[PDB]
């Protein structure tokens, strides 16, 4: 492996603790709820699909939203303004070809003006002190995929599907770090497709035992089981595509035998 892979992993593990939002923030928001957040994140999945944006961009945008809402009260009519600016910033950070501001205005159906989006972009940057290079579940997943025995495209797609579902539901997923959610996503995908488990090479790389992943795994297994019933369905629609080997059509396992 390249001789900076381990350094990058160690550094991302440090940074995910620094870039973590306040776990209880939504209780302190007088006017917004977990349900309104879910709707916003599901909408950003669809925005991502419409503009052919990277998965990483979506993960970054969510990280920025949750950090912003950890320190700023936001009324329900402005929550989509925060989300739009967050996606703009994430696209500028991550994308080769970010969509233009007028296109972001268009996808809000002129709910906000260009001036508002640009002013919110400044506010987001100020509140986040320009610290946009955040670790995401996606960044850990792609590292974990290098330890497959051997590469399985269905396992990758399913792990991605599951990591992405975690973005929608602040309760419970705000209480886990990205590296842990990724671990659980990777194990669950592996188990579902091949019957294998979280490999020893990742136990050594991450220091996470399968046991340490169990709380997050239990939650993620429930999320997986209930996905066809959830009010938000954009992620499921997205992972039906052949690009993702239609993994969202697969039946989850009924038990994990943990």
């Amino acid at each position: 492996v390249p001789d900076y892979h381990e350094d990058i992993h160690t550094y991302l593990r440090e940074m995910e603790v620094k870039c973590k939002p306040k776990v209880g923030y939504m209780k302190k928001q007088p006017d917004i709820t977990n349900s309104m957040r879910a709707i916003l994140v599901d909408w950003l999945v669809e925005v991502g699909e419409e503009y052919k944006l990277q998965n990483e961009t979506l993960h970054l945008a969510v990280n920025y939203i949750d950090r912003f809402l950890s320190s700023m009260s936001v009324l329900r009519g402005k929550l989509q303004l925060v989300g739009t600016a967050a996606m703009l910033l994430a696209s500028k950070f991550e994308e080769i070809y970010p969509p233009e501001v007028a296109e972001f205005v268009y996808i809000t159906d002129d709910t906000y003006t260009k001036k508002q989006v640009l002013r919110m972009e400044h506010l987001v940057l100020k509140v986040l002190t320009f610290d946009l290079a955040a670790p995401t579940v996606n960044q850990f997943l792609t590292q974990y995929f290098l330890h497959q025995q051997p590469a399985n495209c269905k396992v990758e797609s399913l792990a991605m599907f599951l990591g992405e579902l975690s973005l929608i539901d602040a309760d419970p997923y705000l209480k886990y770090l990205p590296s842990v959610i990724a671990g659980a996503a990777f194990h669950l995908a592996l188990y579902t497709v091949t019957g294998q488990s979280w490999p020893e090479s990742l136990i050594r790389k991450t220091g996470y035992t399968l046991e340490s992943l169990k709380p997050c795994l239990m939650d993620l297994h429930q999320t997986y089981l209930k996905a066809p019933q959830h009010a938000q369905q954009s992620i499921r629609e997205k992972y039906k595509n052949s690009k993702y080997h239609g993994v969202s059509l697969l039946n989850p396992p009924e038990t994990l035998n943990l």
């Binding site: 940074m15 703009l88 910033l89 500028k92 950070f93 970010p98 233009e100 501001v101 989006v117 640009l118 972009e121 400044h122 940057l125 002190t129 320009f130 610290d131 946009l132 290079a133």
Partner: peptide, 18 residues
């Protein structure tokens, strides 16, 4: 800048702070 804070600045600032 029609497009807000340019990507180059966003990247330069976020990365150099690290």
């Amino acid at each position: 800048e029609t497009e807000g804070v340019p990507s180059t600045a966003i990247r330069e600032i976020s990365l150099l702070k690290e």
